[PDB]
């Protein structure tokens, strides 16, 4: 009901809309992450068109080193974005 | 414009609505944190009525030990809530 509570559910909703596409339904593989950024973060982040940019973003977000972005890693990503803007 | 982008701005908006009330306008003191939880997280978290609960929550969220909850500490709090529900 609150605007914060709506944001919490939206974070959960959008992660899983993408993570559930292929393979592990609870983690983002590179193609899932790329589509999430391109479709859902177009006002905040430049569209990803090059493989090396995909690779680098995943390298940055994948803290436990399994090659995918899980929900906790996604939340760290959201923290990164939000802080850059609170800042800009 | 996207539902994710709306969530990112809502997180920024609600933090600052509370953090900007008293003292440091970029950090939540205990009374600011308590009001945020009570007013904005009523579907997710039991209302805070006892001082020891205020104290404990702050103790948990205040990683850099300055006695307040800053925006990065708030994002960790949001991560905690979101993960509990993805889980429930
Ligand atoms: O600037 C960003 O928010 C960012 C985006 C993707 C990967 C790393 C970073 S640090
Ligand atoms: O259960 C929670 O989400 C929580 C809330 C306030 C402080 C610590 C925790 S772990
Ligand atoms: C960069 C203003 Hg949220
Ligand atoms: C506990 C369902 Hg978001
Ligand atoms: Ca997946
Ligand atoms: Ca990972
Ligand atoms: Ca304050
Ligand atoms: Ca602190």
Curated annotation (Swiss-Prot), chains A, B:
Q: Name one Pfam family in it.
A: S_100
**UniProt main location, coarse:** cytoplasm
Which positions bind Zn(2+)?
A: 16, 26, 86
One Gene Ontology MF term: calcium-dependent protein binding
**InterPro entries found in the cross-reference section:** EF-hand-dom_pair, EF_Hand_1_Ca_BS, EF_hand_dom, S100-B, S100/CaBP7/8-like_CS, S100_Ca-bd_sub
Q: What PANTHER family does its record include?
A: PROTEIN S100-A1-RELATED, S100 CALCIUM-BINDING PROTEIN
Protein's name according to its UniProt entry: Protein S100-B
Which organism is the protein's source?
Answer: Bos taurus (Bovine)
């Amino acid at each position: 009901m609150s605007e914060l509570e709506k944001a919490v559910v939206a974070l959960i909703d959008v992660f899983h809309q993408y993570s559930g596409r292929e393979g592990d339904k609870h983690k983002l593989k590179k193609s899932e992450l790329k589509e999430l950024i391109n479709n859902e973060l177009s006002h905040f982040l430049e569209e990803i068109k090059e493989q090396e940019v995909v690779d680098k973003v995943m390298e940055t977000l994948d803290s436990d080193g399994d090659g995918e972005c899980d929900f906790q890693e996604f939340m760290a990503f959201v923290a990164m974005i939000t802080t850059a803007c609170h800042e800009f």
